[PDB]
Design a protein around this motif. Structure first.
Motif, PDB file in Angstrom:
ATOM      1  N   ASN E  80      -5.575  -3.274   5.343  1.00 29.66           N
ATOM      2  CA  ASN E  80      -5.947  -2.211   4.417  1.00 29.66           C
ATOM      3  C   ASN E  80      -4.760  -1.760   3.575  1.00 29.66           C
ATOM      4  O   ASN E  80      -4.905  -1.523   2.371  1.00 29.66           O
ATOM      5  CB  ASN E  80      -6.547  -1.035   5.186  1.00 29.66           C
ATOM      6  CG  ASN E  80      -7.932  -1.342   5.723  1.00 29.66           C
ATOM      7  OD1 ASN E  80      -8.345  -2.499   5.778  1.00 29.66           O
ATOM      8  ND2 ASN E  80      -8.658  -0.303   6.121  1.00 29.66           N
ATOM      9  N   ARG E  81      -3.574  -1.637   4.181  1.00 25.39           N
ATOM     10  CA  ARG E  81      -2.405  -1.278   3.386  1.00 25.39           C
ATOM     11  C   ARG E  81      -1.948  -2.440   2.515  1.00 25.39           C
ATOM     12  O   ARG E  81      -1.354  -2.220   1.455  1.00 25.39           O
ATOM     13  CB  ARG E  81      -1.267  -0.790   4.285  1.00 25.39           C
ATOM     14  CG  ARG E  81      -0.694  -1.824   5.237  1.00 25.39           C
ATOM     15  CD  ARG E  81       0.542  -1.275   5.935  1.00 25.39           C
ATOM     16  NE  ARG E  81       1.017  -2.150   7.001  1.00 25.39           N
ATOM     17  CZ  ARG E  81       0.702  -2.002   8.284  1.00 25.39           C
ATOM     18  NH1 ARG E  81      -0.092  -1.010   8.662  1.00 25.39           N
ATOM     19  NH2 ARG E  81       1.180  -2.844   9.189  1.00 25.39           N
ATOM     20  N   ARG E  83      -4.084  -4.354   0.974  1.00 27.86           N
ATOM     21  CA  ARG E  83      -4.983  -4.251  -0.174  1.00 27.86           C
ATOM     22  C   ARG E  83      -4.377  -3.395  -1.282  1.00 27.86           C
ATOM     23  O   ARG E  83      -4.590  -3.663  -2.470  1.00 27.86           O
ATOM     24  CB  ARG E  83      -6.335  -3.685   0.259  1.00 27.86           C
ATOM     25  CG  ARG E  83      -7.192  -4.657   1.048  1.00 27.86           C
ATOM     26  CD  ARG E  83      -8.577  -4.087   1.300  1.00 27.86           C
ATOM     27  NE  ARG E  83      -9.436  -5.032   2.006  1.00 27.86           N
ATOM     28  CZ  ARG E  83     -10.171  -5.963   1.406  1.00 27.86           C
ATOM     29  NH1 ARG E  83     -10.150  -6.077   0.086  1.00 27.86           N
ATOM     30  NH2 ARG E  83     -10.925  -6.782   2.127  1.00 27.86           N
ATOM     31  N   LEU E  84      -3.622  -2.357  -0.912  1.00 25.59           N
ATOM     32  CA  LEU E  84      -2.912  -1.560  -1.906  1.00 25.59           C
ATOM     33  C   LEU E  84      -1.564  -2.174  -2.264  1.00 25.59           C
ATOM     34  O   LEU E  84      -1.093  -2.015  -3.395  1.00 25.59           O
ATOM     35  CB  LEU E  84      -2.718  -0.133  -1.395  1.00 25.59           C
ATOM     36  CG  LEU E  84      -3.997   0.643  -1.082  1.00 25.59           C
ATOM     37  CD1 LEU E  84      -3.666   2.001  -0.484  1.00 25.59           C
ATOM     38  CD2 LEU E  84      -4.844   0.796  -2.333  1.00 25.59           C
ATOM     39  N   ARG E  85      -0.936  -2.873  -1.316  1.00 23.73           N
ATOM     40  CA  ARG E  85       0.327  -3.555  -1.568  1.00 23.73           C
ATOM     41  C   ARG E  85       0.186  -4.674  -2.592  1.00 23.73           C
ATOM     42  O   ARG E  85       1.193  -5.114  -3.156  1.00 23.73           O
ATOM     43  CB  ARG E  85       0.874  -4.109  -0.252  1.00 23.73           C
ATOM     44  CG  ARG E  85       2.316  -4.574  -0.290  1.00 23.73           C
ATOM     45  CD  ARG E  85       2.732  -5.130   1.062  1.00 23.73           C
ATOM     46  NE  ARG E  85       4.092  -5.658   1.053  1.00 23.73           N
ATOM     47  CZ  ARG E  85       4.669  -6.245   2.096  1.00 23.73           C
ATOM     48  NH1 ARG E  85       4.002  -6.381   3.234  1.00 23.73           N
ATOM     49  NH2 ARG E  85       5.911  -6.699   2.002  1.00 23.73           N
ATOM     50  N   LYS E  87      -0.520  -4.624  -5.519  1.00 27.77           N
ATOM     51  CA  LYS E  87      -0.120  -4.257  -6.872  1.00 27.77           C
ATOM     52  C   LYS E  87       1.195  -4.943  -7.222  1.00 27.77           C
ATOM     53  O   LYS E  87       2.218  -4.710  -6.569  1.00 27.77           O
ATOM     54  CB  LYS E  87       0.016  -2.741  -6.992  1.00 27.77           C
ATOM     55  CG  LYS E  87      -1.251  -1.978  -6.654  1.00 27.77           C
ATOM     56  CD  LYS E  87      -1.113  -0.503  -6.988  1.00 27.77           C
ATOM     57  CE  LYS E  87      -0.903  -0.294  -8.480  1.00 27.77           C
ATOM     58  NZ  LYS E  87      -0.845   1.149  -8.845  1.00 27.77           N
TER      59      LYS E  87
END
Ligand SMILES: Nc1nc2c(ncn2[C@@H]2O[C@H](COP(=O)(O)O)[C@@H](O)[C@H]2O)c(=O)[nH]1
Ligand SMILES: [Mg+2]
Ligand SMILES: [Mg+2]
Ligand SMILES: [Mg+2]
Ligand SMILES: [Mg+2]
Ligand SMILES: [Mg+2]
Ligand SMILES: [Mg+2]
Ligand SMILES: [Mg+2]
Ligand SMILES: [Mg+2]
Ligand SMILES: [Mg+2]
Ligand SMILES: [Mg+2]
Ligand SMILES: [Mg+2]
Ligand SMILES: [Mg+2]
Lengths: 143, 354, 118, 21, 92, 110, 95, 51
Positions: E80-81, E83-85, E87
């Motif tokens: 989940n982290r 998925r934001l990483r 970027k």
RNA sequence: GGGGUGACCUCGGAGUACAAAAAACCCUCCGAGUGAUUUUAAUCUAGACAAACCAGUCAAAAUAACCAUAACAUCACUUA
RNA sequence: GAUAGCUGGUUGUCCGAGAAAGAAUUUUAGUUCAACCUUAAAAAUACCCCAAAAACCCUAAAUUCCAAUGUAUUUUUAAG
């Protein structure tokens, strides 16, 4: 000795999210007779009116953590027919994104036996699962 | 013996006579909505919230922040209605809605959310995580202006810091970059405070990166009061919170008592109190940006504890209270043979005089 | 069944004439009760026996001083039909440590401090 | 309880009946 | 651990990699026994744990099997982290 | 004569713990034959309709709303036949936990 | 219970107690639950566990067994590989 | 009454505690008395004759 | 409410016992000495109800298989 | 010196404290437990107990648990 060597072993963590993330927090087991069961840490709630759709994540105390409603201008100007299955799926994706941003990963969702067979709610659950937010909160360590 | 009801009865408004003419709801969902709506009213009898911590019911929260951006309600509503009519005028959108094949610009949704309603959601999220209760103890502010914090894990690896994210010290070792829209006529101050991790004083918090007098958006141009220090949570007690506070100020604030040296590797010197700091700089500073995230222990914390802070890594553990057992009786009645094992000091046969 | 008798609070509402009838102070209530057990404990319930024992009224026709708080007033209401109650009057004030041996308690309900002067 | 002010709060049978000239 | 000459260099490196969570900053590996009330049984347990560590560091066929009930949450939060990483923006 | 079997000892079906009593985990708070008191937070329900505390704390009783399980057809029909302003209330027994969950003690300053 | 025998003049003891009981040196008596072998197919699993589990006695029955048993059965026993040797003594009895 | 229920809250509790502690001490001081040499050596005085 | 005769001897429900528990009568009425079906329903152990004793009641966590979200067998006043 | 759950008798002084029945039983003429009570020892909370609380069709006297307060009694241990 070293002035920074002091420890004070009785350490207190005032963060209310600490135990909820460590899965050692006190789950609210109980009623069993009334529905839904309130044994969780976060609770997904899908309110479907004749006009708008709201997907909220409420805590056991009743406070809303993260919410995504079709009344918001961002989704309202981007989407038509805020009642349809496409609307439910968009709300689910937006709520999954907001949950990933807020850092909440596990939540429960207890729908009715008739709403669980709907088309919009099924696709909403599928979108929430694909977005990274997984249901079925972990079992409490030493429950 | 009967008593008088101390207020209005719940089901005394509806009439008992002629139930057939009275309209009813036939939906369990409608009944559930009605019950959940009625359960939130301030009843006069003993309820669940009063016994399980409704947080003293209403709380007179002090609002310390910028006023809301004054917008024209009539023009806003007219433009929104025009946009809705223009959107519903399309036939392709209706075809997509019928075929259940339509997507949404999540990036534009996120941007518009941050622009119009992000502040209130971030405020309630900070209230849930317990930010204001530990930063001011009596006041909650609204993050009017946004704030994007980002850590660099490499050359093309950028980890954002949202409200309540989990960022490890491995990514948080280097100094992060902040972004927020602002004109070149104001002054800003950034303060990274660790709310959990202080070993001695539980009512105090640590400071990792304090930089004041930020000209506009140029955070590097501003003078840094305290150099950046990577997070260092304990190995036992994990999931500490680190908050980035952004304050807008009008005058050039100068302070020597709060100035930190260049090394600043002393936990005694890195002892901060946001309440006292805001009491000192209440005339000029106003909180407008907030970004808090979670941080637990990892392998990189040992380096920070050993090389930087010159300390031995302390290790805690979530120990549970011992189980309760009644007072041991002389003749236990109908108790299993294991009754003596509940009061055994150690599983070793003790030979006193033999 | 014969059980305890809850006495309604209306009976303990003093009337504007009772003060002048019994010689009481309408503004400031009295401070100390002089209680004296009149009737016996036999043919009386066990709870009344317990109350009359815990109030220190075993020896009949012997006065005892008690507070004027609702705590003891509850028990005094429970066993009101077995004792005589008077207000303690202090014409010479509270006795000091130098007159503790020359004090006396008159029958009308007053506590004289200097009794039998030589 | 009967002597409590909240007596009869669970009373519901008077709300539903489940038992022409 | 760095001065332990009765073990091989890869064995020492594998021990320093695995049991680094219980190694002091001065390079002193520490074992602790408190189960039994007898110091002899305590030392026996300490030496048995040392033997087990030596064996698991020396046997090269260790597939490093890990549990799932306690690591599913870590894997989920890692994904989940990430998925934001995902970027990708140039910085520094 | 004509009536037999009319004798039967009492089942002691009643409330065991009153409000304010400090109980521990597992103590039977109240027993009952029919549903007279419903359980609430940290209160389980045995198969013989007994109510037992799951955490150590103080016992409380509160009048709350009743939302039945959607599988109970009888309760669903009752709810659907209720008028527009009717909300069912029940007497729920709760256990407010007084002891904290756990403590962080120093093991070894490595 | 023959308090004074006819051959030696001592005090005999009943054998039913020694057959269906066991005396711990701490004074407690251990016995089996009555009915742990009758009609198992008609009883619940929890009931079967409660029947199979051992139980202790109260003070009245303890004194009765002490009166019915002589001084021999009240001795201290050190058996080879005795399971109840751990339970022969009592610990942390603050009475 | 003179005082009210809210005013009499714990106004006299140290005295109750002291009285209960005194009762506890009086009950705990219960023990067999001391046996001195006199109680045993005075019995020989029954045969004190005149020489 | 003397024996004989008649009736009963065990277990549960309701009233007697109006509101925590219990409470008898050769007091008034229901019943039970099991059937049908499938989800064939375990071990170990906190802590509690009831009770003279024997007996009866529950039950958090830990275990192996089933959804990786239940297992209290259900129904017949379910109580016997 | 058969046996008696049955009848009768059972010998100096004073003082302290002192009990009228719930459960089994070829048992109601008695026995064995419980609850009270006696003799010694440990402890500390004991009775009165306002709020607030204990069900659903209507239902009285009052009940059960609890502060403070007035008193010192209560609970275990070893014999009974
Ligand atoms: N069961 C029982 N009998 C008593 C009690 N007190 C006295 N008695 C009996 O009553 C008779 C004496 O009558 P009193 O003299 O008490 O009027 C004697 O038969 C005596 O045994 C008691 O507390 N319980
Ligand atoms: Mg009966
Ligand atoms: Mg009956
Ligand atoms: Mg007759
Ligand atoms: Mg016949
Ligand atoms: Mg009991
Ligand atoms: Mg379990
Ligand atoms: Mg004879
Ligand atoms: Mg007989
Ligand atoms: Mg006498
Ligand atoms: Mg006896
Ligand atoms: Mg009251
Ligand atoms: Mg009390």
């Amino acid at each position: 000795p070293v002035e920074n060597e002091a420890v004070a072993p009785e350490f207190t963590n005032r963060n209310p999210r600490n135990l909820e993330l460590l899965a050692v927090a006190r789950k609210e087991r109980g009623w069993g007779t009334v529905w839904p069961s309130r044994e969780f840490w976060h609770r997904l709630r899908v309110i479907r009116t004749q006009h708008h759709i709201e997907a909220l994540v409420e805590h056991r105390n009743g406070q809303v953590v993260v919410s995504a409603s079709t009344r918001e201008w961002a989704i309202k100007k981007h989407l038509y027919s805020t009642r349809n299955v496409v609307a439910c799926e968009s709300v689910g994706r937006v709520l999954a994104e907001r949950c990933l941003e807020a850092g909440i990963n596990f939540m429960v969702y207890h729908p009715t036996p008739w709403e669980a067979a709907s088309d919009s709610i099924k696709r909403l659950q599928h979108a929430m699962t694909e977005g990274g937010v997984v249901l079925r909160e972990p079992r409490r360590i030493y429950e | 013996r009967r008593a008088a009801p101390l207020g209005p009865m719940p089901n005394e408004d509806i009439d008992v006579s002629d139930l057939e003419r009275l309209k009813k709801y036939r939906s369990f969902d409608r009944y559930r909505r009605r019950a959940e709506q009625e359960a939130r009213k301030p009843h006069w009898w003993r309820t669940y919230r009063e016994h399980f911590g409704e947080e003293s019911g209403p709380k007179d929260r002090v609002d310390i922040g910028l006023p809301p951006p004054k917008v024209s309600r009539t023009q806003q509503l007219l433009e929104r209605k025009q946009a809705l009519r223009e959107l519903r005028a399309n036939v392709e959108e209706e075809r997509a809605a019928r075929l259940q094949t339509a997507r949404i610009p999540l990036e534009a949704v996120r941007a518009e959310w941050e622009r119009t309603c992000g502040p209130y959601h971030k405020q309630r999220l900070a209230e849930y995580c317990g930010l204001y209760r530990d930063l001011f103890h009596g006041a909650t502010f609204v993050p009017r202006v946004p704030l994007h914090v980002a850590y660099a894990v490499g050359e093309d690896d950028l980890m954002p810091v949202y409200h309540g994210n989990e960022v490890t010290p491995t990514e948080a070792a280097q100094a992060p970059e902040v972004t927020y829209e602002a004109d070149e006529g104001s002054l800003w101050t950034l303060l990274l405070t660790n709310l959990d991790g202080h070993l001695l004083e539980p009512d105090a918090e640590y400071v990792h990166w304090l930089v004041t007098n930020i000209p506009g958006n140029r955070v590097t141009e501003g003078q840094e009061t305290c150099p950046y220090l990577p997070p260092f949570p304990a190995r036992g007690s994990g999931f500490h919170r680190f908050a980035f506070l952004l304050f807008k100020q009008d005058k050039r604030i100068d302070f020597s008592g709060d100035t930190r040296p260049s090394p600043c590797y002393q936990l005694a010197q890195r002892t901060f109190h946001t309440f006292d700091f805001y009491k000192k700089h209440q005339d000029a500073m106003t909180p407008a940006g907030l970004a808090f995230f979670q941080c637990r222990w990892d392998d990189s914390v040992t380096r920070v504890f050993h090389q930087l802070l010159d300390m031995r890594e302390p290790v805690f553990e979530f120990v549970r209270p011992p189980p309760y057992h009644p007072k041991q009786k002389r003749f236990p009645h109908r108790q299993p043979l294991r009754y003596l094992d509940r009061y055994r000091d150690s599983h070793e046969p003790t030979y006193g005089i033999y | 069944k014969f059980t305890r008798s809850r006495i309604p609070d209306k009976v303990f509402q003093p009337s504007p004439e009772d003060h002048e009838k019994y010689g009481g102070d309408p503004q400031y209530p009295h401070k100390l009760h002089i209680v004296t057990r009149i009737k016996s404990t036999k043919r009386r319930p066990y709870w009344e026996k317990d109350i009359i024992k815990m109030l220190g009224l075993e020896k009949a026709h012997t006065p005892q001083v008690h507070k004027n708080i609702p705590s003891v007033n509850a028990k005094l209401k429970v066993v009101k039909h077995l004792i005589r109650i008077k207000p303690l009057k202090l014409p010479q004030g509270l006795p000091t440590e130098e007159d503790m041996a020359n004090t006396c308690l008159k029958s009308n309900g007053e506590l004289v401090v200097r009794w039998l002067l030589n | 309880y009967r002597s409590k002010p909240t007596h009869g709060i669970g009373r519901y049978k008077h709300l539903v009946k489940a038992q022409v000239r | 651990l760095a001065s332990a000459d009765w073990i091989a260099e890869p064995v020492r490196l594998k021990l320093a990699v695995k049991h680094k969570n219980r190694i002091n900053r001065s390079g002193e590996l520490i074992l602790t026994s408190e189960c039994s009330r007898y110091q002899f049984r305590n030392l026996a347990d300490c030496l048995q744990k040392l033997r087990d560590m030596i064996a698991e560091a020396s046997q090269p066929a260790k597939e490093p099997s890990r549990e799932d009930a306690e690591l599913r949450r870590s894997r989920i939060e890692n994904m989940n982290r990430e998925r934001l990483r995902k970027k990708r923006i140039s910085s520094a | 004569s004509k009536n037999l079997g009319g004798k039967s000892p009492g089942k002691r079906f009643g409330i065991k713990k009153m409000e304010g009593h400090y109980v521990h985990a597992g103590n039977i708070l109240a027993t009952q034959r029919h549903f007279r008191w419903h359980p609430g937070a940290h209160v389980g329900l045995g198969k013989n309709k007994c109510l037992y505390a799951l955490e150590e704390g103080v016992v409380r009783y509160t009048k709350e709303v009743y939302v039945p399980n959607p599988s109970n057809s009888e309760a669903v029909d009752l709810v659907t036949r209720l008028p527009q302003g009717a909300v069912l209330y029940k007497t729920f027994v709760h256990v407010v936990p007084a002891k904290p969950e756990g403590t962080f003690k120093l093991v070894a300053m490595l | 219970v023959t308090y004074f025998s006819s051959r030696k003049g001592k005090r005999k003891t009943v054998k039913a107690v020694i057959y269906r009981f066991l005396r711990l040196h701490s004074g407690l008596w251990l016995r089996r639950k009555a009915g742990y072998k009758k009609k198992l197919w008609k009883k619940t699993a929890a009931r079967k566990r409660r029947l199979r589990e051992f139980v202790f006695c109260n003070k009245t029955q303890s004194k009765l067994l002490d009166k019915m048993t002589t001084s021999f059965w009240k001795r201290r026993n050190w058996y080879a590989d005795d399971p109840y040797q751990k339970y022969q003594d009592r610990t942390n009895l603050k009475v | 009454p003179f005082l009210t229920a809210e005013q009499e809250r714990g106004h006299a509790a140290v005295r109750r505690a002291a009285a209960f502690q005194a009762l506890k001490a009086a009950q705990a001081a219960r023990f067999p008395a001391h046996r001195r040499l006199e109680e045993q050596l005075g019995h020989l005085l029954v045969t004190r004759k005149w020489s």
